Amino acid sequence: RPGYKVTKQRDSELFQIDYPEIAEGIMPRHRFMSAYEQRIEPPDRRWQYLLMAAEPYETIAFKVPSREIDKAEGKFWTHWNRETKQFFLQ
Amino acid sequence: PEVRNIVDKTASFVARNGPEFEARIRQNEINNPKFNFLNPNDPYHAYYRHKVSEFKEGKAQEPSSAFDLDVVKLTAQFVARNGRQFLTQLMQKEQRNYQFDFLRPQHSLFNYFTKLVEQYTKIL
Amino acid sequence: LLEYLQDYTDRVKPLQDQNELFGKIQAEFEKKWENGTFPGW
Amino acid sequence: METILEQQRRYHEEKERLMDVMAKEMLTKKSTLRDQINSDHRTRAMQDRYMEVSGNLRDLYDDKDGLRKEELNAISGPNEFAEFYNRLKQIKEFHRKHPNEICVPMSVEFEELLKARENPSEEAQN
């Protein structure tokens, strides 16, 4: 449960997560999750989180208030620089 | 703050090299108060514990069809003898009245045309 | 007996070059067999 | 007739198909002696075809050196392209689907489940 370091940046035509070594073949994975289910369930739920996870580190979430701007998909739009250990997604 | 800096930095090294260094460093400077922090007897002991895990996670802040086939084959024969990529015997033709829509990569038959020019170029 | 045996060799190994095998046997015949390839002491 | 370009391209393609087919045979498993010898005899006839096609490919370049300068002249020319393209406007109402230039060579040198002998060698008998 170690919080990695994310580097959000407004693009135009993207998140840059530095990840220490996993030592496994499985690349880091993203998923789009809704705020409807949570450990505390408090009011104001009603937005989406772009969630990132890997076994080495812990899980990280990014709030999305816009309805559509990008596609949170694995094959279409992610890249894994496993050698330098930086993770990509746009 | 010295204490937080030595904690943060020592934690970093022990985070990279593993907790095996925590033991070394602790026993190497056990009498030295500069490393008293490594023992549970110090107040910042709990702070350092977090730093180790944090540096390991790499998150903490470091210090500071014939017609179609024959036109595609014939155009490919005269394209493949080109002296330059855009100085072909077909670039002149498009501008001189000759409607040929498969020259643009927007038409699916371009991918077969590229194979035919590659084959005619192999046949040179 | 040979004509049968020669046809048989090529017949059961049809992926091997017949012309190579024939030319090799001919060359060994002329350069060695006719030229004293059997010697005693 | 485009001896320089089309015929040599077709002969090179036919050779590539023959190599792919006897490679596909050497990739597949064999189970009994009869069918091993049958495929090895089939691959012999394919090699005889390969050697003959390669023969013809080598004896088609003498007049190529005769026309190579005129062929290499891609700037001074263009009218011949137009002349041939104008003749390609002959017989427009030819309502037919033509998917057979590569499919027939590929399905010729291949075989169908009941009989493991390809269409070239389909009457071959051990």
mmCIF file of all heavy atoms in Angstrom, chain B residues 25-90, unseen atoms left out:
data_model
loop_
_atom_site.group_PDB
_atom_site.id
_atom_site.type_symbol
_atom_site.label_atom_id
_atom_site.label_comp_id
_atom_site.label_asym_id
_atom_site.label_seq_id
_atom_site.Cartn_x
_atom_site.Cartn_y
_atom_site.Cartn_z
ATOM 1 N N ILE B 25 23.234 -0.632 9.575
ATOM 2 C CA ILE B 25 23.323 0.765 9.971
ATOM 3 C C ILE B 25 23.010 0.903 11.466
ATOM 4 O O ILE B 25 23.773 1.551 12.180
ATOM 5 C CB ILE B 25 22.361 1.646 9.153
ATOM 6 N N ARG B 26 21.930 0.281 11.959
ATOM 7 C CA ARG B 26 21.559 0.357 13.368
ATOM 8 C C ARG B 26 22.670 -0.181 14.254
ATOM 9 O O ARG B 26 23.028 0.491 15.212
ATOM 10 C CB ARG B 26 20.261 -0.411 13.622
ATOM 11 N N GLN B 27 23.226 -1.353 13.959
ATOM 12 C CA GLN B 27 24.287 -1.951 14.758
ATOM 13 C C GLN B 27 25.653 -1.285 14.537
ATOM 14 O O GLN B 27 26.532 -1.398 15.393
ATOM 15 C CB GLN B 27 24.405 -3.447 14.461
ATOM 16 N N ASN B 28 25.860 -0.611 13.404
ATOM 17 C CA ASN B 28 27.099 0.082 13.050
ATOM 18 C C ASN B 28 27.198 1.424 13.754
ATOM 19 O O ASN B 28 28.300 1.925 13.953
ATOM 20 C CB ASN B 28 27.191 0.276 11.536
ATOM 21 N N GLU B 29 26.077 2.003 14.165
ATOM 22 C CA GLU B 29 26.026 3.302 14.818
ATOM 23 C C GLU B 29 25.157 3.244 16.082
ATOM 24 O O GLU B 29 24.665 4.275 16.532
ATOM 25 C CB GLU B 29 25.493 4.364 13.856
ATOM 26 N N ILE B 30 24.978 2.059 16.679
ATOM 27 C CA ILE B 30 24.148 1.854 17.865
ATOM 28 C C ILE B 30 24.458 2.827 19.007
ATOM 29 O O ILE B 30 23.535 3.325 19.653
ATOM 30 C CB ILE B 30 24.294 0.423 18.416
ATOM 31 N N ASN B 31 25.732 3.134 19.257
ATOM 32 C CA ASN B 31 26.113 4.050 20.333
ATOM 33 C C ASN B 31 25.998 5.511 19.915
ATOM 34 O O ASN B 31 25.962 6.385 20.779
ATOM 35 C CB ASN B 31 27.540 3.763 20.802
ATOM 36 N N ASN B 32 26.055 5.775 18.609
ATOM 37 C CA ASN B 32 25.992 7.102 18.018
ATOM 38 C C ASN B 32 24.548 7.611 18.007
ATOM 39 O O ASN B 32 23.658 6.983 17.416
ATOM 40 C CB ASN B 32 26.567 7.086 16.600
ATOM 41 N N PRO B 33 24.291 8.770 18.608
ATOM 42 C CA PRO B 33 22.966 9.344 18.661
ATOM 43 C C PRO B 33 22.497 9.784 17.279
ATOM 44 O O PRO B 33 21.295 9.915 17.085
ATOM 45 C CB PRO B 33 23.128 10.494 19.658
ATOM 46 C CG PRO B 33 24.564 10.885 19.543
ATOM 47 C CD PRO B 33 25.303 9.599 19.306
ATOM 48 N N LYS B 34 23.380 9.963 16.285
ATOM 49 C CA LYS B 34 22.949 10.345 14.938
ATOM 50 C C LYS B 34 22.037 9.285 14.328
ATOM 51 O O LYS B 34 21.290 9.622 13.417
ATOM 52 C CB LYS B 34 24.161 10.579 14.033
ATOM 53 N N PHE B 35 22.074 8.044 14.818
ATOM 54 C CA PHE B 35 21.278 6.931 14.324
ATOM 55 C C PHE B 35 20.331 6.364 15.375
ATOM 56 O O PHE B 35 19.750 5.296 15.174
ATOM 57 C CB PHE B 35 22.183 5.810 13.809
ATOM 58 N N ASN B 36 20.159 7.059 16.503
ATOM 59 C CA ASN B 36 19.259 6.610 17.563
ATOM 60 C C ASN B 36 17.844 6.397 17.027
ATOM 61 O O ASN B 36 17.165 5.475 17.479
ATOM 62 C CB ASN B 36 19.243 7.617 18.715
ATOM 63 N N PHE B 37 17.468 7.156 15.997
ATOM 64 C CA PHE B 37 16.189 7.133 15.314
ATOM 65 C C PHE B 37 15.832 5.719 14.832
ATOM 66 O O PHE B 37 14.660 5.335 14.832
ATOM 67 C CB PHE B 37 16.197 8.102 14.130
ATOM 68 N N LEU B 38 16.823 4.899 14.442
ATOM 69 C CA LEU B 38 16.595 3.536 13.965
ATOM 70 C C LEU B 38 16.040 2.608 15.041
ATOM 71 O O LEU B 38 15.500 1.551 14.707
ATOM 72 C CB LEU B 38 17.890 2.939 13.410
ATOM 73 N N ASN B 39 16.205 2.950 16.313
ATOM 74 C CA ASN B 39 15.701 2.163 17.437
ATOM 75 C C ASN B 39 14.316 2.695 17.803
ATOM 76 O O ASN B 39 14.048 3.880 17.614
ATOM 77 C CB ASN B 39 16.669 2.238 18.619
ATOM 78 N N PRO B 40 13.424 1.864 18.365
ATOM 79 C CA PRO B 40 12.069 2.271 18.746
ATOM 80 C C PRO B 40 12.047 3.281 19.897
ATOM 81 O O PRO B 40 11.005 3.850 20.213
ATOM 82 C CB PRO B 40 11.396 0.943 19.095
ATOM 83 C CG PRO B 40 12.517 0.064 19.541
ATOM 84 C CD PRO B 40 13.682 0.446 18.673
ATOM 85 N N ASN B 41 13.201 3.501 20.524
ATOM 86 C CA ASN B 41 13.399 4.407 21.639
ATOM 87 C C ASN B 41 13.263 5.874 21.218
ATOM 88 O O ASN B 41 13.119 6.739 22.088
ATOM 89 C CB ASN B 41 14.770 4.179 22.278
ATOM 90 N N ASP B 42 13.343 6.180 19.922
ATOM 91 C CA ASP B 42 13.242 7.548 19.409
ATOM 92 C C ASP B 42 11.809 7.868 18.978
ATOM 93 O O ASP B 42 11.082 6.989 18.521
ATOM 94 C CB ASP B 42 14.204 7.753 18.238
ATOM 95 N N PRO B 43 11.398 9.146 19.058
ATOM 96 C CA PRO B 43 10.055 9.594 18.720
ATOM 97 C C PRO B 43 9.740 9.532 17.227
ATOM 98 O O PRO B 43 8.586 9.303 16.846
ATOM 99 C CB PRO B 43 10.016 11.018 19.277
ATOM 100 C CG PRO B 43 11.439 11.470 19.242
ATOM 101 C CD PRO B 43 12.246 10.245 19.566
ATOM 102 N N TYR B 44 10.733 9.753 16.369
ATOM 103 C CA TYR B 44 10.546 9.723 14.924
ATOM 104 C C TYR B 44 10.692 8.313 14.371
ATOM 105 O O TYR B 44 10.599 8.132 13.157
ATOM 106 C CB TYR B 44 11.542 10.659 14.236
ATOM 107 N N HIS B 45 10.919 7.312 15.221
ATOM 108 C CA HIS B 45 11.054 5.937 14.764
ATOM 109 C C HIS B 45 9.873 5.572 13.860
ATOM 110 O O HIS B 45 10.075 5.105 12.741
ATOM 111 C CB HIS B 45 11.144 4.982 15.956
ATOM 112 N N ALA B 46 8.646 5.878 14.291
ATOM 113 C CA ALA B 46 7.448 5.600 13.513
ATOM 114 C C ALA B 46 7.438 6.329 12.161
ATOM 115 O O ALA B 46 6.897 5.811 11.186
ATOM 116 C CB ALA B 46 6.217 6.007 14.324
ATOM 117 N N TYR B 47 7.990 7.542 12.083
ATOM 118 C CA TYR B 47 8.038 8.319 10.848
ATOM 119 C C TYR B 47 8.905 7.609 9.808
ATOM 120 O O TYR B 47 8.501 7.460 8.653
ATOM 121 C CB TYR B 47 8.569 9.727 11.120
ATOM 122 N N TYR B 48 10.085 7.155 10.230
ATOM 123 C CA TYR B 48 11.035 6.464 9.368
ATOM 124 C C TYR B 48 10.427 5.192 8.779
ATOM 125 O O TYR B 48 10.639 4.903 7.604
ATOM 126 C CB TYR B 48 12.313 6.126 10.140
ATOM 127 N N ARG B 49 9.655 4.449 9.583
ATOM 128 C CA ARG B 49 9.024 3.196 9.156
ATOM 129 C C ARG B 49 8.246 3.421 7.868
ATOM 130 O O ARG B 49 8.333 2.617 6.939
ATOM 131 C CB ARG B 49 8.109 2.655 10.257
ATOM 132 N N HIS B 50 7.476 4.505 7.827
ATOM 133 C CA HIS B 50 6.689 4.883 6.671
ATOM 134 C C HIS B 50 7.619 5.223 5.511
ATOM 135 O O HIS B 50 7.431 4.690 4.423
ATOM 136 C CB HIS B 50 5.776 6.064 7.006
ATOM 137 N N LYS B 51 8.636 6.069 5.727
ATOM 138 C CA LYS B 51 9.567 6.478 4.673
ATOM 139 C C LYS B 51 10.127 5.292 3.904
ATOM 140 O O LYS B 51 10.136 5.351 2.685
ATOM 141 C CB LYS B 51 10.719 7.295 5.261
ATOM 142 N N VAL B 52 10.559 4.231 4.583
ATOM 143 C CA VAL B 52 11.114 3.052 3.925
ATOM 144 C C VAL B 52 10.130 2.523 2.874
ATOM 145 O O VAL B 52 10.468 2.429 1.695
ATOM 146 C CB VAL B 52 11.437 1.939 4.940
ATOM 147 N N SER B 53 8.915 2.183 3.304
ATOM 148 C CA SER B 53 7.862 1.673 2.445
ATOM 149 C C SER B 53 7.533 2.652 1.317
ATOM 150 O O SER B 53 7.338 2.245 0.176
ATOM 151 C CB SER B 53 6.602 1.376 3.260
ATOM 152 N N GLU B 54 7.520 3.944 1.600
ATOM 153 C CA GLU B 54 7.220 4.994 0.647
ATOM 154 C C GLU B 54 8.272 5.087 -0.450
ATOM 155 O O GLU B 54 7.911 5.181 -1.624
ATOM 156 C CB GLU B 54 7.095 6.343 1.358
ATOM 157 N N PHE B 55 9.563 5.083 -0.087
ATOM 158 C CA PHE B 55 10.616 5.133 -1.086
ATOM 159 C C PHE B 55 10.566 3.872 -1.945
ATOM 160 O O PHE B 55 10.835 3.934 -3.138
ATOM 161 C CB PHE B 55 11.983 5.286 -0.416
ATOM 162 N N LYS B 56 10.215 2.726 -1.350
ATOM 163 C CA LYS B 56 10.117 1.459 -2.077
ATOM 164 C C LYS B 56 9.004 1.549 -3.116
ATOM 165 O O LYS B 56 9.170 1.093 -4.250
ATOM 166 C CB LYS B 56 9.867 0.302 -1.108
ATOM 167 N N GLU B 57 7.874 2.155 -2.741
ATOM 168 C CA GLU B 57 6.739 2.340 -3.636
ATOM 169 C C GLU B 57 7.099 3.357 -4.722
ATOM 170 O O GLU B 57 6.448 3.388 -5.767
ATOM 171 C CB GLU B 57 5.507 2.792 -2.852
ATOM 172 N N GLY B 58 8.123 4.177 -4.485
ATOM 173 C CA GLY B 58 8.620 5.199 -5.386
ATOM 174 C C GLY B 58 7.629 6.347 -5.523
ATOM 175 O O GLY B 58 7.385 6.798 -6.641
ATOM 176 N N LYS B 59 7.046 6.804 -4.404
ATOM 177 C CA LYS B 59 6.063 7.892 -4.402
ATOM 178 C C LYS B 59 6.473 9.103 -3.571
ATOM 179 O O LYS B 59 5.988 10.212 -3.831
ATOM 180 C CB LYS B 59 4.710 7.391 -3.894
ATOM 181 N N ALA B 60 7.299 8.905 -2.543
ATOM 182 C CA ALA B 60 7.733 9.987 -1.675
ATOM 183 C C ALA B 60 8.526 11.051 -2.428
ATOM 184 O O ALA B 60 8.970 10.872 -3.560
ATOM 185 C CB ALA B 60 8.497 9.427 -0.471
ATOM 186 N N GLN B 61 8.661 12.200 -1.770
ATOM 187 C CA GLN B 61 9.379 13.353 -2.267
ATOM 188 C C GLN B 61 10.808 13.268 -1.743
ATOM 189 O O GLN B 61 11.033 13.282 -0.526
ATOM 190 C CB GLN B 61 8.685 14.646 -1.833
ATOM 191 N N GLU B 62 11.780 13.137 -2.642
ATOM 192 C CA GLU B 62 13.183 13.083 -2.259
ATOM 193 C C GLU B 62 13.544 14.411 -1.555
ATOM 194 O O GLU B 62 12.811 15.402 -1.689
ATOM 195 C CB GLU B 62 14.065 12.836 -3.485
ATOM 196 N N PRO B 63 14.639 14.464 -0.785
ATOM 197 C CA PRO B 63 15.040 15.660 -0.057
ATOM 198 C C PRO B 63 15.621 16.746 -0.963
ATOM 199 O O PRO B 63 15.738 16.582 -2.180
ATOM 200 C CB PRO B 63 16.047 15.120 0.961
ATOM 201 C CG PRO B 63 16.620 13.905 0.311
ATOM 202 C CD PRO B 63 15.478 13.295 -0.451
ATOM 203 N N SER B 64 15.920 17.886 -0.352
ATOM 204 C CA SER B 64 16.495 19.061 -0.977
ATOM 205 C C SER B 64 17.258 19.745 0.144
ATOM 206 O O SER B 64 18.184 19.102 0.688
ATOM 207 C CB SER B 64 15.398 19.929 -1.595
ATOM 208 N N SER B 65 -13.789 -7.997 -62.139
ATOM 209 C CA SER B 65 -12.574 -7.367 -61.512
ATOM 210 C C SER B 65 -11.308 -7.284 -62.351
ATOM 211 O O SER B 65 -10.275 -6.841 -61.860
ATOM 212 C CB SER B 65 -12.187 -8.069 -60.168
ATOM 213 N N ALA B 66 -11.314 -7.738 -63.633
ATOM 214 C CA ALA B 66 -10.142 -7.681 -64.492
ATOM 215 C C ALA B 66 -9.633 -6.273 -64.783
ATOM 216 O O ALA B 66 -8.448 -6.010 -64.642
ATOM 217 C CB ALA B 66 -10.418 -8.416 -65.819
ATOM 218 N N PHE B 67 -10.536 -5.310 -65.097
ATOM 219 C CA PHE B 67 -10.175 -3.920 -65.351
ATOM 220 C C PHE B 67 -9.417 -3.308 -64.182
ATOM 221 O O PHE B 67 -8.359 -2.709 -64.347
ATOM 222 C CB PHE B 67 -11.484 -3.103 -65.608
ATOM 223 N N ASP B 68 -9.938 -3.520 -62.965
ATOM 224 C CA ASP B 68 -9.408 -3.069 -61.705
ATOM 225 C C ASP B 68 -8.022 -3.639 -61.442
ATOM 226 O O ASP B 68 -7.080 -2.928 -61.103
ATOM 227 C CB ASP B 68 -10.381 -3.504 -60.572
ATOM 228 N N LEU B 69 -7.853 -4.957 -61.665
ATOM 229 C CA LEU B 69 -6.581 -5.636 -61.555
ATOM 230 C C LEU B 69 -5.556 -5.137 -62.565
ATOM 231 O O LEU B 69 -4.427 -4.807 -62.210
ATOM 232 C CB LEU B 69 -6.819 -7.158 -61.745
ATOM 233 N N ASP B 70 -5.942 -5.022 -63.849
ATOM 234 C CA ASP B 70 -5.078 -4.569 -64.916
ATOM 235 C C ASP B 70 -4.680 -3.102 -64.812
ATOM 236 O O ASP B 70 -3.512 -2.774 -65.015
ATOM 237 C CB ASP B 70 -5.674 -4.937 -66.294
ATOM 238 N N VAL B 71 -5.582 -2.165 -64.430
ATOM 239 C CA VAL B 71 -5.161 -0.794 -64.137
ATOM 240 C C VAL B 71 -4.216 -0.712 -62.946
ATOM 241 O O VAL B 71 -3.206 -0.024 -63.028
ATOM 242 C CB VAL B 71 -6.263 0.263 -63.994
ATOM 243 N N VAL B 72 -4.473 -1.438 -61.835
ATOM 244 C CA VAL B 72 -3.584 -1.476 -60.678
ATOM 245 C C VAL B 72 -2.226 -2.100 -61.017
ATOM 246 O O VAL B 72 -1.176 -1.580 -60.639
ATOM 247 C CB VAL B 72 -4.274 -2.166 -59.494
ATOM 248 N N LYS B 73 -2.178 -3.219 -61.779
ATOM 249 C CA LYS B 73 -0.928 -3.800 -62.252
ATOM 250 C C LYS B 73 -0.163 -2.909 -63.233
ATOM 251 O O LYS B 73 1.048 -2.761 -63.098
ATOM 252 C CB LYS B 73 -1.106 -5.230 -62.855
ATOM 253 N N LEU B 74 -0.835 -2.280 -64.222
ATOM 254 C CA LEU B 74 -0.207 -1.381 -65.183
ATOM 255 C C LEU B 74 0.330 -0.097 -64.570
ATOM 256 O O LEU B 74 1.454 0.331 -64.838
ATOM 257 C CB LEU B 74 -1.193 -1.013 -66.319
ATOM 258 N N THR B 75 -0.437 0.559 -63.672
ATOM 259 C CA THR B 75 0.059 1.726 -62.950
ATOM 260 C C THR B 75 1.231 1.386 -62.057
ATOM 261 O O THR B 75 2.184 2.151 -61.968
ATOM 262 C CB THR B 75 -0.972 2.498 -62.138
ATOM 263 N N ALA B 76 1.221 0.205 -61.413
ATOM 264 C CA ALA B 76 2.326 -0.289 -60.622
ATOM 265 C C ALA B 76 3.612 -0.526 -61.415
ATOM 266 O O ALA B 76 4.705 -0.203 -60.960
ATOM 267 C CB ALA B 76 1.883 -1.564 -59.890
ATOM 268 N N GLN B 77 3.503 -1.044 -62.656
ATOM 269 C CA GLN B 77 4.606 -1.182 -63.599
ATOM 270 C C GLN B 77 5.276 0.142 -63.973
ATOM 271 O O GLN B 77 6.497 0.238 -64.096
ATOM 272 C CB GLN B 77 4.090 -1.855 -64.897
ATOM 273 N N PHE B 78 4.487 1.215 -64.171
ATOM 274 C CA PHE B 78 5.029 2.526 -64.474
ATOM 275 C C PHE B 78 5.403 3.344 -63.237
ATOM 276 O O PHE B 78 6.243 4.239 -63.302
ATOM 277 C CB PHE B 78 4.017 3.318 -65.328
ATOM 278 N N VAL B 79 4.825 3.051 -62.059
ATOM 279 C CA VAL B 79 5.269 3.603 -60.784
ATOM 280 C C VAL B 79 6.606 3.039 -60.334
ATOM 281 O O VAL B 79 7.454 3.791 -59.873
ATOM 282 C CB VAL B 79 4.190 3.495 -59.709
ATOM 283 N N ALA B 80 6.857 1.725 -60.504
ATOM 284 C CA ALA B 80 8.043 1.047 -60.004
ATOM 285 C C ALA B 80 9.366 1.430 -60.668
ATOM 286 O O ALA B 80 10.444 1.127 -60.167
ATOM 287 C CB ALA B 80 7.831 -0.471 -60.163
ATOM 288 N N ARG B 81 9.322 2.132 -61.814
ATOM 289 C CA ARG B 81 10.507 2.584 -62.520
ATOM 290 C C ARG B 81 10.852 4.038 -62.196
ATOM 291 O O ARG B 81 11.628 4.687 -62.893
ATOM 292 C CB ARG B 81 10.301 2.401 -64.047
ATOM 293 N N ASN B 82 10.256 4.612 -61.132
ATOM 294 C CA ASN B 82 10.460 5.988 -60.726
ATOM 295 C C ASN B 82 11.867 6.387 -60.267
ATOM 296 O O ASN B 82 12.553 5.683 -59.532
ATOM 297 C CB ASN B 82 9.401 6.423 -59.681
ATOM 298 N N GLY B 83 12.321 7.600 -60.661
ATOM 299 C CA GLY B 83 13.609 8.134 -60.206
ATOM 300 C C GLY B 83 13.565 8.839 -58.875
ATOM 301 O O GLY B 83 14.587 9.237 -58.329
ATOM 302 N N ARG B 84 12.360 9.046 -58.324
ATOM 303 C CA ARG B 84 12.163 9.705 -57.053
ATOM 304 C C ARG B 84 10.750 9.369 -56.627
ATOM 305 O O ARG B 84 9.896 9.096 -57.468
ATOM 306 C CB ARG B 84 12.359 11.238 -57.226
ATOM 307 N N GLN B 85 10.440 9.404 -55.314
ATOM 308 C CA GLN B 85 9.163 8.979 -54.753
ATOM 309 C C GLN B 85 7.950 9.685 -55.348
ATOM 310 O O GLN B 85 6.964 9.051 -55.713
ATOM 311 C CB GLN B 85 9.176 9.245 -53.226
ATOM 312 N N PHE B 86 8.029 11.019 -55.510
ATOM 313 C CA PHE B 86 6.936 11.816 -56.038
ATOM 314 C C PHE B 86 7.181 12.261 -57.475
ATOM 315 O O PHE B 86 6.407 13.025 -58.038
ATOM 316 C CB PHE B 86 6.698 13.063 -55.147
ATOM 317 N N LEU B 87 8.250 11.767 -58.132
ATOM 318 C CA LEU B 87 8.478 12.019 -59.549
ATOM 319 C C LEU B 87 8.265 10.719 -60.295
ATOM 320 O O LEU B 87 9.192 10.038 -60.732
ATOM 321 C CB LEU B 87 9.878 12.606 -59.827
ATOM 322 N N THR B 88 6.990 10.319 -60.401
ATOM 323 C CA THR B 88 6.592 9.067 -61.018
ATOM 324 C C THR B 88 5.918 9.338 -62.339
ATOM 325 O O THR B 88 5.497 10.452 -62.649
ATOM 326 C CB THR B 88 5.670 8.189 -60.153
ATOM 327 N N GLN B 89 5.723 8.273 -63.137
ATOM 328 C CA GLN B 89 4.997 8.337 -64.386
ATOM 329 C C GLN B 89 3.477 8.245 -64.156
ATOM 330 O O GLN B 89 2.695 7.988 -65.067
ATOM 331 C CB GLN B 89 5.539 7.193 -65.281
ATOM 332 N N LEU B 90 3.019 8.515 -62.911
ATOM 333 C CA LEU B 90 1.623 8.522 -62.518
ATOM 334 C C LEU B 90 1.225 9.816 -61.815
ATOM 335 O O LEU B 90 0.118 10.305 -62.015
ATOM 336 C CB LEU B 90 1.369 7.334 -61.564
#
